[PDB]
């Protein structure tokens, strides 16, 4: 028992991190087969950042302008192309550590692990959620661009995030691995700002089931609620609407705990309305929304990978 | 910016995990050079667990009783020995993925990453602290024994924990990698129970500095306190005493933020006495004590490893 924010093992992704240098800008790239993926703003100059035309900037580049280093071993760039906001540097060497992988564009509310890197070297690993406003509440400093977010499914790394920029509230914006930003953001160093964020209701409910599985039950009650009446309360508290599909996703957890989804909704309703009264759930004094139903099942049943 | 519970990259340790089977018991081992380290209770039978004599049980074993598997590749045991509560199985093959490593026995309050494993395969990675009562608040299920906790220092993995057992409160007990339990616990399946736990004060203060570095300042005040007067309040709240050595450890963070250690103590004092009044710090509604001063500096300056 116990319940932690658990990241995926990072070894498969560590073997892919490289350093990409263009001009005075250094950041991280993802080396898979004979391609290195990195943010296209690597080709920006410290004065191009206000409104760059990346097509111009890129056509002005030569392969030898890109310094790619994998450890100490330097990688020859033999070609380059732009795909949306990611740069794809073809190198003359296939990464022998390339895992089975996919690129996936995730939905808001989905979670992933971030391998934070500087100069192509990992600093640490942590779990994140794509917020409903399409930011992530990461831990990123200058030089972390090109760090990636990912999930693992048995043997396959699904890359879903590459880091590009930090917004004025200290939250983070980035793209999928095909270079499409999550949310309305653009790789221009002008004012943008996240939209209003909301709490991921289906994830809060999953975490309440995690709590029950682990022996916290103090927040349960005999009440129930209709989904309609639950969403009236959730809306009032900037929680995301709960859908019938969410209810269905919560089925396995509901069956394992014997607590109907809609009954757990009535517990969450009372928690929203009365607070927690000095009590904690799974070591938190807030309602946690960065565990999906899937995250709860993995951690509480011991699913492994390789 | 941002601040997360960040684990060390786990790749160096993943390359060391194996599966050890003895009888009907399967658990994880740590394969370093030509030795596999695992909990000695692997040799226990489901009826020996109440008060086993491990010297007897072990002398009754043969090398071929130990089934060690590294992936699909099976490892021949060519020898075995007991060191305190760990079993050391000599195998005929040196792990080619062996990292630079050390074994370290940590002090309470120190943090480490746990690579949770089942059947020799990693399930996930998370950050932990050795509690003052020498338990860890882990996330461990049956089969996770032999999972290890570790820190990384540039290129060197310092292993500090191996998992053995779960206590009735859902917290976890284990040994260093030389088999010495942390705390008073023994590998006997009889009632034991953790002692009363306390909050790691020096770590709370480090996390308050993390908050300042990241732009949370609402909890600061113009007050100061003496170390004596601070510990009078801390004692009242089952916080650990703050030592002058703790104050000294907090020096770099104090210098970076311009907030004298003893002034941050006065902020913590008011937080203990008034609570947080619906406010959060670094996304928590509780005072967090599982970041060391060192953890804060690493994460807020971008220290990497390899």
From Swiss-Prot, chains A, B:
Q: Which sequence ranges are listed under topological domain Cytoplasmic?
A: 1-306
What does the annotation give as the result of altering residue 49 to A?
Does not affect ability to cleave and inactivate human TRMT1
| Subcellular location(s) of the protein | Host cytoplasm; Host Golgi apparatus; Host nucleus
Mutation: residue 205 to V; reported impact is: In strain: Zeta/P.2
Where is the Peptidase C30 domain positioned along the sequence? 1-306
| Location in chain, cross-link Glycyl lysine isopeptide (Lys-Gly) (interchain with G-Cter in ubiquitin) | 5, 90
Q: Where is the active site?
A: 41, 145
Q: Which reaction does it catalyse?
A: TSAVLQ-|-SGFRK-NH2 and SGVTFQ-|-GKFKK the two peptides corresponding to the two self-cleavage sites of the SARS 3C-like proteinase are the two most reactive peptide substrates. The enzyme exhibits a strong preference for substrates containing Gln at P1 position and Leu at P2 position
What does the record give as the function of this protein? Cleaves the C-terminus of replicase polyprotein at 11 sites. Recognizes substrates containing the core sequence [ILMVF]-Q-|-[SGACN]. Cleaves and inactivates human TRMT1, preventing tRNA guanine(26)-dimethylation of tRNAs. May cleave human NLRP1 in lung epithelial cells, thereby activating the NLRP1 inflammasome pathway. May cleave human GSDMD, triggering alternative GSDME-mediated epithelial cell death upon activation of the NLRP1 inflammasome, which may enhance the release interleukins 1B, 6, 16 and 18. Also able to bind an ADP-ribose-1''-phosphate (ADRP).
Subunit details for this protein? 3CL-PRO exists as monomer and homodimer. Only the homodimer shows catalytic activity. Interacts with host FBXO22; this interaction promotes the proteasomal degradation of nsp5.
* Protein name per Swiss-Prot or TrEMBL: 3C-like proteinase nsp5
| The species this protein was found in | Severe acute respiratory syndrome coronavirus 2
Covered part of the full sequence, start to end and full length, is 3264 to 3569 of 7096
């Amino acid at each position: 028992s116990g319940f932690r924010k658990m990241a995926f093992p990072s070894g498969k992704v560590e073997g892919c991190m490289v350093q990409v240098t263009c001009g005075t800008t250094t950041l991280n790239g993802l080396w898979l087969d004979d391609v290195v993926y990195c943010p296209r703003h690597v080709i920006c100059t410290s004065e191009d950042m206000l409104n760059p035309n990346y097509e111009d900037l890129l056509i002005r580049k030569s392969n030898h302008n890109f310094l790619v280093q994998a450890g100490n071993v330097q990688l020859r760039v033999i070609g380059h192309s732009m795909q949306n906001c990611v740069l794809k540097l073809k190198v003359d060497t296939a990464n022998p550590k390339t895992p089975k992988y996919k690129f996936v564009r995730i939905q808001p509310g989905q979670t992933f692990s971030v391998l934070a890197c500087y100069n192509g070297s990992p600093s640490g690993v942590y779990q994140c959620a794509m917020r409903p406003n399409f930011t992530i509440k990461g831990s990123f400093l200058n030089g972390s661009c090109g760090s990636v977010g990912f999930n693992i499914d048995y043997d396959c790394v699904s890359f879903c995030y590459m880091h590009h920029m930090e917004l004025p509230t200290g939250v983070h914006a980035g793209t999928d691995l095909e270079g499409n930003f999550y949310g309305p953001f653009v790789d221009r160093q002008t004012a943008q700002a996240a939209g209003t964020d909301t709490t991921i209701t289906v994830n809060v409910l999953a975490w309440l089931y995690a709590a029950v599985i682990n022996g916290d039950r103090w927040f349960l009650n005999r009440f129930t609620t209709t989904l309609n009446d639950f969403n009236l309360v959730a809306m009032k508290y900037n929680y995301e609407p709960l859908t019938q599909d969410h209810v269905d996703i919560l089925g396995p957890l509901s069956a394992q705990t014997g607590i109907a989804v809609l009954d757990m909704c009535a517990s969450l309703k009372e928690l929203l309305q009365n607070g927690m009264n000095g009590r904690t759930i799974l070591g938190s004094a807030l309602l946690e929304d960065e565990f999906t139903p899937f995250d709860v099942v993995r951690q509480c049943s011991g699913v492994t990978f390789q």
